[PDB]
Design a protein around this motif. Structure first.
Motif, mmCIF file in Angstrom:
data_model
loop_
_atom_site.group_PDB
_atom_site.id
_atom_site.type_symbol
_atom_site.label_atom_id
_atom_site.label_comp_id
_atom_site.label_asym_id
_atom_site.label_seq_id
_atom_site.Cartn_x
_atom_site.Cartn_y
_atom_site.Cartn_z
ATOM 1 N N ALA A 1 -0.112 45.114 31.173
ATOM 2 C CA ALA A 1 0.217 45.929 30.072
ATOM 3 C C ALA A 1 1.629 45.766 29.545
ATOM 4 O O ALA A 1 2.626 45.587 30.468
ATOM 5 C CB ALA A 1 -0.191 47.308 30.237
ATOM 6 N N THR A 2 1.908 46.390 28.121
ATOM 7 C CA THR A 2 3.221 46.555 27.695
ATOM 8 C C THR A 2 3.385 47.974 27.534
ATOM 9 O O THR A 2 2.758 48.567 26.926
ATOM 10 C CB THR A 2 3.272 45.675 26.415
ATOM 11 O OG1 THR A 2 3.136 44.276 26.588
ATOM 12 C CG2 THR A 2 4.877 45.897 25.962
ATOM 13 N N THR B 1 -1.538 43.285 23.985
ATOM 14 C CA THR B 1 -0.583 43.779 22.869
ATOM 15 C C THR B 1 -0.937 43.045 21.466
ATOM 16 O O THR B 1 -0.651 41.747 21.458
ATOM 17 C CB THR B 1 0.811 43.669 23.261
ATOM 18 O OG1 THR B 1 1.294 44.194 24.265
ATOM 19 C CG2 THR B 1 1.919 44.188 22.088
#
Lengths: 51, 51
Positions: free
Chosen positions: A50-51, B51
């Motif tokens: 994830a970001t 994302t």
């Protein structure tokens, strides 16, 4: 005072630091009339892209 | 035309809404000379960190 302090009430002490002592000294309730809904209890996911 | 009058055509009706009725009423082809290459048929991936 003597015994009978806290009036035979179920007494709960806030330890997690949510208590706001400038708002209240104590809150007295009929606990039959307050309900907390639990749609999901504390749930964990491990993120590694994830970001 | 009380009976089937497009004999000699295999007839395909567009139903996915791709048809542009202002461009064509119908398209007639020698289907031996049209090829569709399928390099990858439709695939699904579930994304939960992207994302």
């Amino acid at each position: 005072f003597r015994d009978g302090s806290f009036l035979g009430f179920n007494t709960h002490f806030n330890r997690n630091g949510a208590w706001a002592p400038t708002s209240a000294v104590g809150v007295i309730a009929d606990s039959s009339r307050v309900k907390i809904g639990v749609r999901q209890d504390i749930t964990v996911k491990f993120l590694d892209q994830a970001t």
